[PDB]
Design a protein around this ligand. Structure first.
Ligand SMILES: CCCCCCCCCCCCCCCCCC(=O)OC[C@H](COP(=O)([O-])OCC(O)COP(=O)([O-])OC[C@@H](COC(=O)CCCCCCCCCCCCCCCCC)OC(=O)CCCCCCCCCCCCCCCCC)OC(=O)CCCCCCCCCCCCCCCCC
Ligand SMILES: CC(C)=CCC/C(C)=C/CC/C(C)=C\CC/C(C)=C/CC/C(C)=C/CC/C(C)=C/CC/C(C)=C/CC/C(C)=C/CC/C(C)=C/CC1=C(C)C(=O)c2ccccc2C1=O
Ligand SMILES: CC(C)=CCC/C(C)=C/CC/C(C)=C\CC/C(C)=C/CC/C(C)=C/CC/C(C)=C/CC/C(C)=C/CC/C(C)=C/CC/C(C)=C/CC1=C(C)C(=O)c2ccccc2C1=O
Ligand SMILES: CC(C)=CCC/C(C)=C/CC/C(C)=C\CC/C(C)=C/CC/C(C)=C/CC/C(C)=C/CC/C(C)=C/CC/C(C)=C/CC/C(C)=C/CC1=C(C)C(=O)c2ccccc2C1=O
Ligand SMILES: CC(C)=CCC/C(C)=C/CC/C(C)=C\CC/C(C)=C/CC/C(C)=C/CC/C(C)=C/CC/C(C)=C/CC/C(C)=C/CC/C(C)=C/CC1=C(C)C(=O)c2ccccc2C1=O
Ligand SMILES: CC(C)=CCC/C(C)=C\CC/C(C)=C/CC/C(C)=C/CC/C(C)=C/CC/C(C)=C\CC/C(C)=C\CC/C(C)=C\CC/C(C)=C\CC1=C(C)C(=O)c2ccccc2C1=O
Ligand SMILES: CCCCCCCCCCCCCCCC(=O)O[C@H](COC(=O)CCCCCCC[C@@H](C)CCCCCCCCC)COP(=O)(O)O[C@H]1[C@H](O)[C@H](O)[C@H](O)[C@@H](O)[C@@H]1O
Ligand code: HEM
Ligand code: HEM
Ligand code: HEM
Ligand code: HEM
Ligand SMILES: CCCCCCCCCCCCCCCC(=O)O
Lengths: 161, 524, 166, 524
């Protein structure tokens, strides 16, 4: 392909004076032929109406997402508390036994087993979860779901040393 | 402000393209807003769909409801059905939004069909605008399939039945490719685990993007190939008579947009559409007397209902009956974009056209279009066989046979009647051109003759009878009152009159204004 | 034209811009030639009432959305009738507000913006012969200067490669 | 074909806009392709993402794998992670496509950054192009967030940890709104059931649509506000020197597009990126020493790592330490698009500019930019603290303190050295202007003097010394061989010589051509 050089002559800067004058004349005639300059009640009415419609529509469009973080939804032994203050280590009926259960990683019947003091050495660390006997092993579907909800909790895991 | 505009000029300096677009002229005919209806429906669809995507989960994995709608607590459903139930019952405004969405989809389809009717019957598809006809046809097909995929996302019983029957069982029966297409589309057998996410992707991204691109190209072609117009006083094949964009056309377009949004909001609030909770989740063992997809897909359903069972069995092979339905559907989809070229080949007319035709002046094409609309209406009524038989006390077998026979005997009858009707309208125009407008007043002519006192539109002879005029493709007045004859009541408001001086002044001003308007348009 | 195009009125400047664009205005006339009359005051009042109604209905939509009981309470122990009005009220207020604003805008256009007739002068058909000749010359030179007309090996090789890749 | 062109002309008749767009001139500098790299990588991202949406299910409901990847059989995973594993292991080509996708994302980010650096250091953001600067800044922020949302869709352990830490825990601690934003975004506490579908919608529809619209506006502004250029022989503030679109520029652009596609394909096929199967599904109890989001987000991670623990506690309220990271990130995001206006109100230069500046002639701005780059590099190296301390034998606390102190003391050092280096380059230019190019040849001058035998670039005075020239904003030669001095060897192929006549003819033709080109650009 042959080699070339080309020059373009930008023609940059502000527009030509005839162009500027004609555009301004068009817009000015459009604005002052409508007489809107002397209808203050109509200007105010349009402003108020559009403001009300826009605000109502925006509030309706954005209101479905907003949720109150502090409403009591979690049942405890002292009523109902907000999610961000409860853990799963919180007692539910004033005296319930919550064990420190360790995970087996297995899917046979237990994914969580109890612990005794002698099930560890003086240099051991173990991750433990709250057991709550009424959950049982994960043989039935309801117990499987309870154990899944135990395992998927961001404030559940505890380090025992 | 002066400073902002001055800086915009010194930086981008349009100032001539801006003027060129501010002085663009558009014709003002009520029928040229039918495409705007579809455009505004599409904008509302975009907004409401973007809202809906923040709450939907298009998965087919099964769960138990355990929600607020008690009559469904404990039922095994999919994640998509549960997401739709949550949108309906637990988001503040979600039911309202999805009802607006479905109503906007129906208005979109109806507006597209009415606009196609206008284009076809006025002839705006001729030589310069054939490519735009083709683009519009593609847009119609795409809108049909987009809506079909749309109402199948909430995987409930009725939409699942429609999916199964139409998509799965008609794809599966195609002659050679058939099961290969079915398995490439479903990932296997009919109820899989990828169909709903695949349709969700296709429905929120692919088809909307293609439709947006095609709408852009369509509107660009309409903007740069100027609009057609009807024949009239000052109108010519070389000019455009109308209003300029800047003060008037933008105002009218925005007002129409607001009005259409208002209508859609009213009917999305006041009328219930697709109550999925009265149904259940889709299950292959349950069925209901419910059928009939959205109205823009009803003609395929009616064709499948009234087609006779003609199958073919040869060496270890089978061609079932729905292959006929698929063939007729594809034949329609092919014949729709080819009509401009077929008509120009038949008529031998290869000229350029900027002036529209009146439907009465093209009797053969008007009769063709009426026949096609009659065929479509028969197929659409055949889709509601059971509802018609239940509400209007007719037998089900009777309705089936009525549709089967009407589909063949009604369209040519409509063709014949439409032809004769257009010619009769032409003869009425010719009578009004030859004599004057009939005024309705009778005289008795002392020797006992009754006359009718016509009113001429042009010059009369020395004997008083008007001189006949020539037809020019424009409508002719038939009522005396549509010409200024007996009008302009008192100039009060509704209960108290103004002053007589003000009334007379306003009358004279209006008369002078209308006279100068008609003069300025007729003389030049 | 020339630097003394100033001191030229707005009407002449607008006619000049139209003439440059190919447009001509016939019959642009004000809507109210007679001085102050009661008809004009009534027209302004009627236009304003619709916008005020739109504002009222927008405020109603806001307040209804904020304070209406919206949760699902359907049963027949305590028959609600209040939950079943929520979406109807949403739609009613929203649609009435925006439709009143639309009607007000249409009335203002019909009664206060002046009525005009404009002619555009399509300039349709084939392009000017100078434009045609120049574009065809540009493309012809771009094609013939590349020499590809006499490189059959290169053309065929490009075809084969692009087809294989595609 | 001629008949097709005649039909096109009679129906649309462009023939003048097409000529205006064929005659547009573009400059030829290698640094003008840095935006094209980002454009082409965005196109590749679009294509590969459209492919990927046909197989992905973005659901957070848990299932058991039972797939082909044995070391993961029986594990509880979400539906998104399982669909990612399916794309990787059970679609023919899926792993290839997603690796191309991820490499294209990395190339997109790197090219945006290099192009921004070129714009900043050449000063192409001055008066007429400030809005292009602002649009580019918005594009940069949107690209960062789009990639971040992208690599979180396959819900595995590293992406889950990054999501948790950055998104959840930084949003939750914001002073007054805080938890309200967290709960509006997540639908409740951190691991919900709507997060991955919401991010999937945001990632495949909303952000890509916004980015496409902004890229279109960017390219339109660049097309209609013509391109800048460097000062040179025939260049002026009122012209553009380069090549026309049609024969040369489009050809070069297509070739560069193909080359970029090839590089991305090579490195998507031969280099393994993000092997999610070596990880596991995300679980709130597990963790690995792995960290470090994709490289374009590493400075926020490093800022979080090296910022000191400064917290405030007053009446029943708390302001944690990551609020500083949030504040600094927002401060950068605000100061990035405001730089043109800050510099113009500081320097007092409000004029139009079409010619670029060499970075050595603007020492203060070059030093500011180098200081900013040093800050970014320190924050990026701080993000790989543990990787660096493992590979290179340094203590972890030592690396943390090194980052913490370097953040304060390195950027001013870089500023100072850059300033002095720029002035040194200017002085070398002035030297080669006042004397000639130093050839490197020494003489002995029989009375025992050593001279250097310079070569003049202009006219010479009576004593043989050249007169000093004036700087003109253009680079100057420093090596003799770059000027045609000793070149053009024999004209064979590589192992056998051509004929002497052909060699001489080619030599003379080349010399005449180059001299005519030089004259044609120098004289006028
Ligand atoms: C996709 C998503 C989009 C959805 C659709 C939404 C919009 C649809 C488009 C309809 C509106 C059209 C508006 C328009 O065209 O005006 C362009 C208009 C060009 O006017 P023009 O110079 O007279 O026309 C060019 C030729 O003269 C024309 O002269 P000609 O008579 O010889 O015509 C020859 C024609 C012959 O060819 C054709 O007729 C077919 C054109 C099809 C294009 C492919 O060739 C063309 O004109 C091609 C033009 C294509 C560019 C614009 C169209 C893009 C839309 C395409 C969508 C996707 C495809 O540009 C403007 O100036 C409009 C105002 C904007 C300036 C404001 C600046 C203010 C300061 C900026 C500050 C920065 C912040
Ligand atoms: C939230 C949830 C509850 C439901 C969501 C529903 C959703 C769809 C709400 C949509 C809101 C939507 C923005 C309403 C439309 C607003 C309208 C257009 C008001 C303006 C109309 C009128 C009063 C003023 C005149 C309009 C003109 C003069 C200005 C604007 C204008 C517009 C709006 C055009 O569409 C237009 C099209 C083509 C050429 C020019 C124009 C133009 O100038
Ligand atoms: C040349 C000049 C002289 C004139 C040109 C015009 C000329 C007369 C054309 C010749 C006629 C001929 C070429 C057309 C034959 C008819 C067609 C094309 C054969 C098969 C077409 C068909 C299988 C493809 C259409 C797509 C559909 C129907 C395939 C199956 C199918 C699918 C795939 C669905 O997804 C679906 C979803 C919901 C409801 C139904 C269906 C459905 O039936
Ligand atoms: C799965 C599977 C295995 C991989 C998926 C990923 C893959 C498919 C990515 C997409 C691959 C695809 C996009 C390849 C495109 C490569 C193209 C550009 C080959 C043509 C290159 C050719 C040698 C150069 C000649 C073409 C030129 C002269 C004309 C076309 C042309 C082009 C192509 C421009 O990009 C262009 C840009 C701006 C102005 C003008 C032009 C222009 O004229
Ligand atoms: C000069 C002059 C004219 C201007 C300079 C001064 C200027 C006006 C100061 C304003 C800048 C500051 C104070 C605003 C930011 C402070 C504060 C409100 C930050 C709030 C949230 C910020 C924007 C981002 C938070 C944030 C979010 C929301 C994430 O989702 C996220 C996800 C992954 C990683 C990180 C983040 C993250 O930091
Ligand atoms: C047909 C149908 C209706 C029949 C029935 C079919 C059926 C029944 C219905 C549909 C059902 C289903 C099955 C259909 C499936 C369809 C499927 C989903 C399709 C999806 C679409 C597809 C797969 C997407 C992939 C293709 C796509 C992503 C690639 C296109 C690339 C995009 C659009 C371009 C973006 C870049 C753009 C903004 C810039 C353009 C480049 C510009 C013009 C030049 C660049 C450039 C410029 C501008 C400079 O100014 C410049 C200045 C100085 C130096 C250099 C440059 C420079 O290089
Ligand atoms: C626009 C602002 C106006 C929005 C008003 C919407 C009305 C909502 C309402 O009144 O609800 C109460 C809300 O209290 C309030 O006063 C809200 C006041 C606003 C507080 C702070 C604002 C929120 C954050 C996002 C600030 C953003 C703006 C700051 C800019 C930062 C940049 C942004 C990127 C809480 O009751 P709740 O039970 O949680 O709400 C139900 C659900 O439970 C149930 O899931 C159902 O789905 C819900 O729809 C709802 O019914
Ligand atoms: C352009 C033409 C479109 C048509 C004809 C259409 C039609 C429909 C219809 C009829 C439904 C069923 C409504 C119902 O639930 O009763 C639907 C659902 C849906 N549409 Fe669209 N739509 C269109 C565009 C879009 C776009 C652009 C988006 C997103 C950006 C979208 C997002 C959705 C979603 C998420 C759903 C499922 C939510 C639900 O069913 O409640 N749609 N569509
Ligand atoms: C989503 C689908 C469509 C949209 C949004 C749309 C929109 C429009 C609009 C706004 C106009 C100009 C105003 C008017 O003439 O009413 C127009 C004109 C036109 N449409 Fe469509 N239309 C669509 C579908 C179709 C179909 C199905 C056909 C067939 C078609 C063919 C045409 C033609 C030929 C014109 C030019 C007519 C003329 O200039 O006189 N379009 N379209
Ligand atoms: C435009 C800028 C984009 C960026 C920066 C980006 C970035 C990313 C990245 C880094 C990933 C991780 C891929 C992996 O390692 O598995 C990803 C995933 C994904 N992206 Fe994109 N992407 C972009 C555009 C798109 C588009 C336009 C689409 C669809 C139309 C898309 C669809 C997807 C999908 C479906 C995934 C998940 C599938 C998978 O992980 O294999 N992306 N994105
Ligand atoms: C996705 C992001 C971006 C894309 C696709 C893009 C693309 C381009 C292209 C192709 C050009 C013209 C060719 C060139 O000069 O290399 C350009 C010019 C320009 N870009 Fe970008 N860019 C992006 C981001 C940015 C950023 C971050 C800034 C800051 C910026 C500011 C500018 C300016 C001011 C110009 C005009 C410079 C001149 O005309 O000399 N852009 N851009
Ligand atoms: C077009 C009409 C074709 C009618 C085919 C009917 C054949 C039925 C065969 C059985 O078996």
């Amino acid at each position: 392909i042959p080699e070339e050089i080309s020059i373009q002559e930008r023609h940059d800067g502000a527009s030509r004076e005839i162009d500027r004058k004609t555009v301004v004349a068009n817009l000015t005639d459009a604005f002052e032929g409508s007489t809107i300059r002397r209808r203050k009640l109509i200007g105010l009415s349009f402003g108020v109406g559009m403001g009300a419609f826009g605000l109502g529509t925006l509030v309706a469009f954005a209101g479905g997402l907003i949720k109150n973080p502090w409403k009591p939804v979690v049942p405890t032994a002292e009523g109902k508390k907000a999610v961000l203050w409860t853990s799963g280590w919180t007692p539910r009926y004033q005296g319930e036994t919550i064990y420190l259960a360790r995970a087996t990683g297995t899917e046979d019947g237990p994914p969580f087993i109890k612990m005794r003091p002698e099930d560890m050495d003086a240099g051991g660390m173990e991750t433990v979860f709250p057991w709550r006997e009424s959950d049982g092993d994960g043989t039935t579907v309801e117990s499987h779901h309870k154990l899944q909800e135990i395992a998927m909790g961001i404030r559940n895991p505890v380090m025992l040393i | 402000l002066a400073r902002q505009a001055e800086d915009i000029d010194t930086r981008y300096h349009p100032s001539a393209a801006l003027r060129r677009q501010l002085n663009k002229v558009f014709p003002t005919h009520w029928s040229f807003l039918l495409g705007e209806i579809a455009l505004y429906s599409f904008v509302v669809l975009l907004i409401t769909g973007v809202y809906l995507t923040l709450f939907f989960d298009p998965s087919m994995v099964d769960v138990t409801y355990n929600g607020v709608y008690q009559p469904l607590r404990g039922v095994e459903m999919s994640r998509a059905y549960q997401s739709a139930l949550d949108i309906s019952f637990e988001v503040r405004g979600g039911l309202f939004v999805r009802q607006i969405h479905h109503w906007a989809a129906l208005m979109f389809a109806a507006a597209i069909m009415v606009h196609l009717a206008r284009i076809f019957f006025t002839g705006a598809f001729r030589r310069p605008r054939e490519t735009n006809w083709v683009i519009g046809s593609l847009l119609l097909i795409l809108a049909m399939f987009e809506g079909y995929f749309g109402y199948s996302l909430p995987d409930d019983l009725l939409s699942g039945l429609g999916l199964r029957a139409a998509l799965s069982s008609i794809t599966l029966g195609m002659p050679v490719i058939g099961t290969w297409l079915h398995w490439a589309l479903f990932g296997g057998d009919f109820p899989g685990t990828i169909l709903i996410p695949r349709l969700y992707a296709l429905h929120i991204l692919l088809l909307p993007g293609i439709i947006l691109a095609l709408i852009g190209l369509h509107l660009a072609l309409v903007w740069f190939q100027k609009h057609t117009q009807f024949p009239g006083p000052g109108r010519t094949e070389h000019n455009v008579v109308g209003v300029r964009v800047m003060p008037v056309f933008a105002f009218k377009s925005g007002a129409f947009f607001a009005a259409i949004v208002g209508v859609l909001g009213l009917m999305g609030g006041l009328l219930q559409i697709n109550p999925i909770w009265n149904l259940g989740p889709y299950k292959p063992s349950q069925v209901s007397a419910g059928s009939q997809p959205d109205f823009y897909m009803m003609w395929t359903e009616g064709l499948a209902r009234i087609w006779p069972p003609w199958e073919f069995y040869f060496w270890h092979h089978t061609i079932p009956a729905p292959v006929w339905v698929a063939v007729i559907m594809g034949l329609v989809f092919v014949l729709l974009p080819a009509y401009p070229f077929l008509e120009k080949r038949f008529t031998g007319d290869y000229a350029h056209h900027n002036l529209l035709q009146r439907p009465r002046d093209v009797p053969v094409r008007t009769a063709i279009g009426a026949m096609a609309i009659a065929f479509y209406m028969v197929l659409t009524l055949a889709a509601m066989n059971d509802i018609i038989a239940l509400k209007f006390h007719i037998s089900l077998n009777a309705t089936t046979w009525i549709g089967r026979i009407g589909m063949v005997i009604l369209p040519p009858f409509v063709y014949f009647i439409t032809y004769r009707w257009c010619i009769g309208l032409q003869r009425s125009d010719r009578s009004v051109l030859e004599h004057g407008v009939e005024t309705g007043i009778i005289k008795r002519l002392p020797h006992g003759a009754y006359i009718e006192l016509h009113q001429p539109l042009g010059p009369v002879d020395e004997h008083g009878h008007p001189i006949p005029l020539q037809y020019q493709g424009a409508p002719l007045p038939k009522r005396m009152n549509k010409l200024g004859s007996a009008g302009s009541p008192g100039s009060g408001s509704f209960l108290f009159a103004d002053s007589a001086a003000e009334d007379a002044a306003l009358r004279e001003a209006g008369h002078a204004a209308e006279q100068r308007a008609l003069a300025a348009l007729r003389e030049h | 034209d020339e630097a003394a195009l100033a001191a030229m009125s707005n009407q002449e400047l607008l006619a000049l811009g139209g003439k440059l664009d190919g447009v001509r205005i016939a019959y642009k006339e004000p809507r109210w030639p007679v001085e102050g009359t009661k008809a004009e005051k009534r027209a302004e009042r009627s236009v304003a009432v619709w916008l005020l109604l739109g504002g009222v209905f927008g405020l109603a939509l806001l307040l209804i959305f904020l304070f209406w009981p919206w949760e699902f309470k359907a049963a027949d122990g305590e028959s609600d009738f209040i939950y079943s009005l929520t979406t109807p009220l949403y739609g009613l207020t929203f649609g009435l507000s925006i439709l009143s604003i639309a009607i007000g805008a249409v009335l203002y256009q019909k009664r206060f913006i002046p009525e005009e007739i404009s002619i555009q002068e399509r300039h349709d058909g084939a392009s000017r012969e100078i434009d045609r000749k120049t574009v065809v010359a540009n493309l012809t030179d771009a094609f013939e200067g590349s020499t590809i007309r006499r490189r059959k090996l290169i053309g065929l090789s490009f075809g084969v490669g692009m087809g294989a890749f595609g």
